[model samples]
Target: TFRRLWPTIAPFKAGLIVAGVALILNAASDTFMLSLLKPLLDDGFGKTDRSVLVWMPLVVIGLMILRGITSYVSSYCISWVSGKVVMTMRRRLFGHMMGMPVSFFDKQSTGTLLSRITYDSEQVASSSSGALITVVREGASIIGLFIMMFYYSWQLSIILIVLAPIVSIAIRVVSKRFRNISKNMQNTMGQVTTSAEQMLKGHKEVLIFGGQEVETKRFDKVSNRMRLQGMKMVSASSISDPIIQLIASLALAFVLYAASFPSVMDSLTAGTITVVFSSMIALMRPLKSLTNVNAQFQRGMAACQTLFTILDSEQEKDEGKRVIERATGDVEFRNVTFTYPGRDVPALRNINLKIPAGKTVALVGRSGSGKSTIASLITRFYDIDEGEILMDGHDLREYTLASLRNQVALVSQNVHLFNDTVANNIAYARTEQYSREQIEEAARMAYAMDFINKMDNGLDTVIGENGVLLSGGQRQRIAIARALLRDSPILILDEATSALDTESERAIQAALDELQKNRTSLVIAHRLSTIEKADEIVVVEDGVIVERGTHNDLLEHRGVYAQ
Candidate 1:
C-alpha cells in the first residue's frame, strides 16, 4: 500500500530528500547541543580559561543558528510536499472515478464518495508527512541519544536496550485497537456525510411536507454515531501515551536505583551522570511521537484501502477494436436478456426488436416494465446477459464506447443541468462547432427560445443548481435543446416531455416531429397521445414484448395497449 502512494509522492521526492537532510542536521545539532552541556558544567564553569569562555558562546550561537535554519527548511519542504501529494491524489482519484462505469455510482452515494476523496485523501497526506517526519527527525534523536548513553556506560546502555522491547510491545498492543477504531471512524464520517447530503438536496421537499423533524432525527442518528466513533478513536489514541509514559517511568526508576549502588556510583562522574540520564529521558520524546503517529498511520492506511478499492474496480469494458466514424442509426436487439444485479428475475428477457436507419420506434409501458432498460442497453451502460445488440450489422460491443456514444443523444425524464449560464449548459461538449447563434437557434427549434429570451440574461442567464431557477417544463426544454444541438444520428427520449403541460407538449410536438425525420429515435413514453404518430409502437410488460404494432393496430386489438 505504501508502494501505491509512491506515484503520488514521487513528484515530491527531491523535496522529501531535502527535508530529510535538514532533519538530520537538526537532530545532530540537538545531540551536539546536549553534548556541550557536559563541557559547560565540567570545564567552562569550574576552571574556564579566557579563550575557552570566548569560543564556547560563539560555538553555542553557531549551533543555535544552524538548528533554526534546518528547522525552517524542513517545515516548509514537508508542507509543500504534503500539499502537492494530496492535490495530485485527489485529481487522479476524480479522473479515475469519471472513467468508472455508471453502475459504480449507482451503488455508492454522492456524499460517501465525496468523503473518500476529501477526508480520506487528507488522512493519507497527514500520515505520509507526520509519520515519516517523526520517523526521520525524532528517530535521529534516538540514535544520537543512544550513542551518548553508550559513551557514558555500556552497562546502562545495554539495560536500556533490553527494556526498549517492552515499550514497543505496549505500543504494538494499543496500535491494533487504534487501527480498528480508525476504520470505524472513517465509515461513520461517510454516514454523516451521506445523511447531510440527502437532506440538503431535498430541503425543499422537507420544508413543504413538514419533514423537518424526520430529517433532523435522521441526521441526529447518523451524527450521534459519528460522535461515538470519534470518541472511540480519541480514547484509543489518548490511552496509549500514558501507557508509554508509565513504561518509560518504570524503566527510568529501575535505572536510577541501580546506578545509586556503590559499584556504579564510585565509577560515575557528574559528566557521565548528565550524559546518561539526559539521553535516557530524551529517548521518551521520540517514543511518544512514534506512538501518536502510529495512530495516524493506521488511520491513513484505512483510508488508503478505500481509495485502492475504487481504483481497482473494473473500468467500463470498452476493449472493442472498431472505431465508429459515424453510425447510420441502424439498431437491432437479437435475443437480448439482462437482469439487474442482485435480482433473480430479469429486467429484460430474451427481447428482440429492430429499428432501421432513419426510423422512429416508441416503447409504451408502465414504470418498471423495462422500457428505460432497453434504452440503457443500447448505450451499453450495462452489458446484456445473453445474445447480441447490433448497430450497423455489428455487435454494439464491437465499437469503442466513446465512438458509439458520439452517435447517440439522450434526453431522459430526469433532466440534469449544470449551475452555469444557459448558453454554457446548452453548448456544453458541443462547443467545437456550435457558436452563440447556433445555440440560440437550437433553443428556438426546441421551443425554448421564448422563455430563454424572457429571462434577465437570455442565453447568458445563470441557472441555479440543476436549473432550479427554471420551471420543470423549461428545464426539460433546455435539455431537449442540448440534445438538439448534439444532433446525434440516434436519439433517445425516455418520457422526455413528462413534465410539460398538454399545451406545451402540443406546441413542442411539431418540432419533435421535424427532429425525428430521417433519424433513428427510441422513445419511451407513458402518454399514448405523444406516440400516436410513431411509425412502430412496442408495448412491453414484465420484461417482455407483450404486444407490438402501430397505434391503430394495438387500439383495434383492445389488448394491453388499449386498456
Candidate 2:
C-alpha cells in the first residue's frame, strides 16, 4: 500500500533525491563525530599535543558546519516537494470531481467530496514528504550507527538485531488500529462538515422555527464522534511509540549486562566499549523516529486509498462519435423505457413523443409522473434502458455531449445564482458572447430589467449567494433572462415561473410566450391555466402517458387531463 504512491512522488523525484543525499551526508557526519569520540577519549586527551587539540576542535567545528548545511538543504527540499505534491493532487481531485457523472454526485455527500479534495490530498502530501524524510534521514542514521556498533563489537550488535524484531511486532500490532482510526476520523470529519454545511444552508429555517436546540444537538452529536475518533488515534500513536522505546531500553540493558561478563571484558578496550555504547544510544534516536513515523504512514495510506477510489470511478459517459455544431431543434423519443438504478419502478416506460422545430410541448402530470425525467433524457443525462432519443433525426447519443447541450437552455424551479454581480449571473458562462445591449435586451424580455435598474448598481449589483438578496420572482426572472441570453434553439422550463404570484406569473408568462415563439420549448407545469395555449399537452401517470392532445382537446376528452 505504501509503495503504491510512487507516481505522486515521481514529479518531485529530483527534489527527493537532493534531500536524500543531504540527509545521508548529515547522518554520515553524525556517525563520523561519534566515531571520533573513541579516539578523542583514548588518545587525543592523553597525548597533550598542542596540534592534536587544535585540529580536533577544528574537525569537530567542520563536522558541525557540514551537518547544519545538509540539514537545512534536506528540510528546504522536502518542504518544496511536499507543496508541489499537494498542489498537483488538489487540481487532479477538482478536475475529477467536475467531470464526474451526476449519478456519482447523487451517491456522494458534498462535504465528503470536499474533504477528499482538501483534507485527504493534504494528508497524502504530508505523509509522503514528512514520513519519507524521517524514514530516509533517520534510516541512514540508524544504518551508520549500526555499522559503528558492529565494527566495535559484533556480538552486542547482533543481539540488538535479534531483539529488534520484537519492537516491530508492536508496530505491526498498532498500525492496523492506526489506519482504522484514521479512516474513521476522516469519515467523522466529513460528517461534521456536512452537519455544519446543512446548518448554514438552512439557517433561516432554523431561526424561523426556533430550532436552535435541535440544530445544536445534531451538531454536537457528530462533533463528539469526531472528537472520540481523534482521541483514539492519539491513544494508538502515543502508546505504540513508548512500547517500542521500552523494547529498545530492554535490549540496551541486556547488552550492558552481556558486556559485563569476564570473557567479553577481556577482549574489549575502553575505547571500543565507549564507541559501542555511544553508537547504541545513538541508534535509539533513529529507531524511535522510524517507529513514530508509522502513524503518519498509515494515515497517509488511508487518505490515498480514499482519493484513489474517487479518481478511479467512471466519469460522465460521452461516447458519441458524431458532433453537431448546431442542432435543428427537433427532438424525438421513440419507444423509450428507463428506470433509475436500484429501483423496481421505472421512471419512464415505453414513451413515444415528438416535438418538431418551432413548436411548444407542455408536460402536466402528478408529482413523480416523470415530467422532469423526460427532459433529463432529452439532454441525455442518463442513458435510457431501451429505445432511442433523437435530435434532428440523429440519435441523441450520436451527437457530442457538449454540442448537444449547447442547443438547449434550461430554467428550473430552483434557480441558483452565484455570489456575483447580476450581469455576471445573466451572462454567466458566455460573458464574451453577449454585448451589454444584448444582455439588457434579454433581461427586458424576461421582465428582470425592472428590478435590476432599481438595484444599487443596476446590472452590476452583486446578488449574494443563490441570489439571497433577491426575491423568488426576482431570482427566477434572472434565470429566465440567462436562458433568453443563450438564444438556444431548444428551451426547457420546469416550473420556471411557479415561484411567482398570479400577477407576476401572468406578467412573466407573456415574456415566456414570446421567447418560445420560434424555439422548440418543453415545459413541465402544475398550473393547468398556463398551458391552456400550449401546442400539445402530455399527461402522464405511473410513468406512462395517459393523455396527449391540445389543451382544449384534452379538456374536451374528460380524461386524466380534465381531472
Candidate 3:
C-alpha cells in the first residue's frame, strides 16, 4: 500500500524530508529534556556549584524551545503534504470516473463512488499523514529513550527488552482486528451514504407513496451497522493500549527489583538510575502511541487498496485511428446486436437501418423495446455485441469517439440542466466563447425565452440543481435550446417533448421541425402523432424492427404501426 502511495507522495518529497528532519530533532529534544533529570537530581540535590544550577535551568529552557519549534514545523509540513495528497486523489478519482465506460456506472452505485471520494480518501489522508507522523516521531522518541536506558544501565534495559515479544504479539492481534474491521466499516459507510442519497433524491416519491416508515427502517438498519462497526474498531484499539502498558509496567517492576541487587547497584549512580527509571516511563507513551497508530495505518492501507482498485480499472476504449472535422451525417446500423451486461435477453438484435444525410427517421416502440438503446449505441456508450454502426461510410469504431460524438446532439426525456445561469445552460455544449445573442436566439427558437426573461435575473438567473425550480416542460425546453445551440450534423430527440403539455408540445414541435431541417435526425417517441411527418418510420417490437416505411406506407399495411 505504501508503495502504491509513493507516486502521489513523491511530488511532496521535499516537504516530507523537512518533516522527517524536524521529527528527529523533536525526538532528540525530548531525550535531552529527560536526560536533564539526571543532572538536576544528582548535582542540584547535593550542594552543587552555582554555575551547575544556573546553566542547568538555561539548558532545560533551550531544549523546550527546540522541541516546540520542531513540533510545529513537522506538524505543519505533514499537514500540507496530506492535504495535497487528498486533493490529488480526489481529482484523479473523479477524472478517471468521467473517462470510464458508461457500463462501468451500470454496475456501481453513485453512493459507493461518492464514498470513495469522501470517506475512503479521508482514511488515506489519516494514514498518509497522521499515522506516518506518529510512527516516525514516536518511533524516534522510543529509540532515543531506549538508547538512554541502555547507556545508563545495561542490566535494567535487558529486562525491558525481554517484554518486546509479548507487546508485539498483542499489537499484531489488534492490528489484524483493525484491518478486517476497517474494510467492513468503509463498505458500511458506503451503504450509509447510498441510503441517504437515495432518500434525498426520491423524497417526493417516498412522501407520495407513504414510504417514510419503510425508508426509516431501511436507514436505521444501515446506520446501526455503521455504529456497530465503529464500536468494534474502538474496542480493538482501546484494548491493545492497556494490555501492552500492563506488560511494560510488569517489566518496569522487575527492573526496579533488579536495581536493588548489590551487583547492579555497584555500577549505578543516583543520576544514572534516575535517568534509566524516567526513560523507562517515557518509553511507554511513545510505545503506546505507536500501537494506537497501527489501527489508523491498517485502515489507510485498506482504503488505499479500494481506491487503487478503481484507479486501475480499464477505461472506455477509443481505439479508432480516423479523425474527421465533421461528418456528412449519414448513419447506418448493419445487422447490429447488443445484450446488456449480465442480462439474458438482447436489448437489440439483427437490426439494419440507414438515415441519409439531411433526412429524419423516427423509431416508434413501446417501453423497453430498445428505442433509447439504439440512441445510446450511436453515441458509443456501449459497443455492439455484433455487426457495425457506420457514419459517413466508415465504421463508427473507425472514427475517434470525440469526432463521432461531435457530429451528434441529443435531447432525451430525462433532461439534465446544470446548476448555472440560464445562458450557461444553453451554451453548455460549446467550448468556445458564446455571445449573448446566440444564447438568446437558441432559447428563442426553443420558445424558452418567454419564461427565462420573466425570471428574476433573466439570462443570469441561477437554475437550482437539475433545474428543480423549473417545470418539466421548462426543463425540456432548456435542453432543446442547448441542442439547438450545438447545431451538430446529427440530432437525436428521444421523447424530448414527452414532458410538455399539448400546446407546449405543438409549439416545440414547430421549433424542432425547423431544427431538424437539413440534418440527419433520429426521433424516438411512443406518441404516434409526433412521427406522422417522418420520412421513414420504423416500428420496433422485442428487439427487432417489425415494420419500416413512410408514415402513410406503414398505416396502409394495417400492421403494428397502424395500431
Candidate 4:
C-alpha cells in the first residue's frame, strides 16, 4: 500500500527525514541528561564538594536547555512535512473520488466519504506529528538508558527485561479494543460532520419543509453516538496509562527497597549503584510514552489504512477506452440491459432504439420508466450493462472522455449554478477565459440577458449559492446559456424547462426552439407538449424502450406511450 500510495508524498521526503532525525536527537538528549541523575544522587550528593555541587547543577540545566532547543527543531521539521503530506493526500483523494463513476457518488453517503477525507486524515496527521514521532525518538532514548543501567547492575536489568513480556500482554489486550473503537469513532464522526453540513447547506429547505425539529433530532442522535464511541477510545487510552504506571511504580519500589539492604549496598560501588538507579528513574517518561503511543499508533494505523484504501480504489475506466470524436447524435440501444451497483433489478433491459442527429428525442413514461437513464447513457453517466452508446459511428469508450464530452452539453433538472458573476455563470463551461462579447452572446441565446440587464451589476452581478439570489427561471436560463456557450453539437435537456412558469416556459421554449437548430437535441421532459413535434420519441419503461416513433405515430398507437 505504501508503495502504491507513495506518489502523493514523493515530494516531501527531505523534510520528513530531517524532522525524524531531529526528534531522535531531542529524545536522546532528554534521556541521556536524566541518566546523570544516578551519579549525582549516589556520588555527588554524599560528597557535597562545593565546586562539584555548583558545576553539577549547571551541567544539568545546560543539558535541559539543549534538549528544549532540539525539541523545537523537531517540531518545526515535523510540522513542515505533515502539512505537505496532508495537502498532497487531500488533493489526490478528491481527484480519485471524482473520477469514480457517477453511480459511485450515488451509492456512497456523503458523510462516510466526508469522514474519511477530513476527520480521519486529521487524526492520522496529528498522531504522526506528535505521538508517533515522540515514541520513536524517546523510545530509543529509553532503550539507550536501559542498556547503561543493565551494564552496571545485570540483575536489575534482567528483571526489567522480564517486564517486556508482561507489557506485551497488556498492549495486546488494549490494542484490540483500541482498533475497534477508533474505527467506530471515525465513522460516527463522519456522520456527525455530514449531518451538520447538510443542515447548514439545506437550512432553508429544512425550515420551509418543517423538518427542522426532525433534522435537529437526527443530529442529536448522531452526536450522542459519536460521544459514546469517543468515550470508548478514551477508555482504551485511559487503561494503558494506569497499567504501565502501576508496573513502573512497583518496579521502582522493589529496586529502592532492595538497594537499602546493607549487604546489597556493600556489594556494589555506591557510585555504580547510583548511576544505575538514576537511569532507571529517568526511564519512567519514555515508558509512559511507549504505552500511550502504542494506543495512538493503532488508531493512526486504522485511519490511514481506510484512507489509503479509498485512494487506492479503481477509478473510472476513462483511459484506453473508446472516445466519441463527434456526435452524429444517433444514440442507439440494442438488446440493452442495465443495473446499478448493489442493485438486484436491471434499470433497463433488452432495449433497442436509434434516433438520428439534429432531431428532438423524448423519453416519456411513468416515473420509473428509465427516462432519465436514457439521458445518463448519452452522457455516459454509467456504462450500459449490456449495450454500447455510439457517437458518429464510434463507441463512447473509443475516445477519451474529454474528446467525446467536448461536443456534448447537458442541462439537468437540477440547475446547479456556481456562486459567481452573471457573466461568469453564463460562460461557466468556458471557464473564466470567456471574453465579454462571448458571454453576452450566450446570455442572449438563453434569454438570460433580460434579468441580467435588470440587475444592478448587469453581467457582473454575483449569484449566491445554488443561485439563491436568482429566481428559478433565471437559474434555468443561466444553465441553458452555459450550455449554449459550449457550442456543442449535442444537447441533453433533462427537464430543462421544469422550473419555468407558463410565461417563462414560453420564452424559454422560444430560446430552446432556436437552440435546437443545427444540433441534436434530446429532451427528457415530464410534459408531452414540449416534444409535440419531435422528429422521434422513444418511450422508455423500466430501462426498456416500449415505444419509438414520431409524436403522432406514438399517439396513434395509444399504448403506454400515449398514456
Query: What order do candidates take by lDDT, descending?
Result: 3, 1, 2, 4
lDDT tens readout by residue for model 1, 173-201: 76666667777777777867787888789
Q: Which parts of model 4 have CA positions greater than 4 angstroms off?
A: 2-10, 32-64, 128-131, 147-246, 263-278, 291-295, 319-329, 344-346, 418-429, 432-434, 450-471, 502-506, 549-563
Q: What local distance difference test score does each model get?
A: 0.76, 0.76, 0.77, 0.70
Candidate 1 residue 185 C-alpha distance from true site, Å: 15
lDDT of 2 at 275: 84
Question: Which 10 consecutive positions of candidate 4 have the poorest summed lDDT?
Answer: 1-10
Model 3 alpha-carbon drift over 4 Å, by segment: 48-65, 170-242, 266-270, 289-298, 325-328, 419-421, 454-469, 502-507, 553-563
Winning model by TM-score: 3
Per-residue CA lDDT of candidate 3, range 1-563, in tens?
87888899899888888999999999999998888877776777765767778889789889999999999999889888887888899899999988798887877645688799878898898776778788889899988988877877787778777775566566567656766766676677677778778777888888899759988887788778778767875775667557766777777777778877887554777888889888878876676677678667878988999999998899988898677665665789878888876684557878888777777787766646566778877788877777788878788788888878877788765676777777787776563578888877777787777778888777778786844387777767777777678557788778734555756666677777887776678888766665676777877766687878677766775444444
Which one wins on lDDT?
3
Clash count list over all predictions: 0, 0, 0, 8
**lDDT of candidate 4 over 1-563, digit per residue (tens):** 33444565568778778777777777667666656665565556766656666677788888888788877877777777777777667777888888877776776656688887888777667665666586768777777777776766766666666765565455556655665767776777786678777767988888789858888887788778778767876776677657756766777676666665677444656666766667777766666566667667667656778888887777777863555445765776667677766674656776777778788887765656466777777777877777666567766666577666667788764677777677777766565577888877776777767677877777777785744377777666777777777567788887734555766667676777777777687777666675586778777767766667677777785654343
**Candidate 1's C-alpha lDDT?**
0.76
Best of the two (1, 3) by TM-score: 3
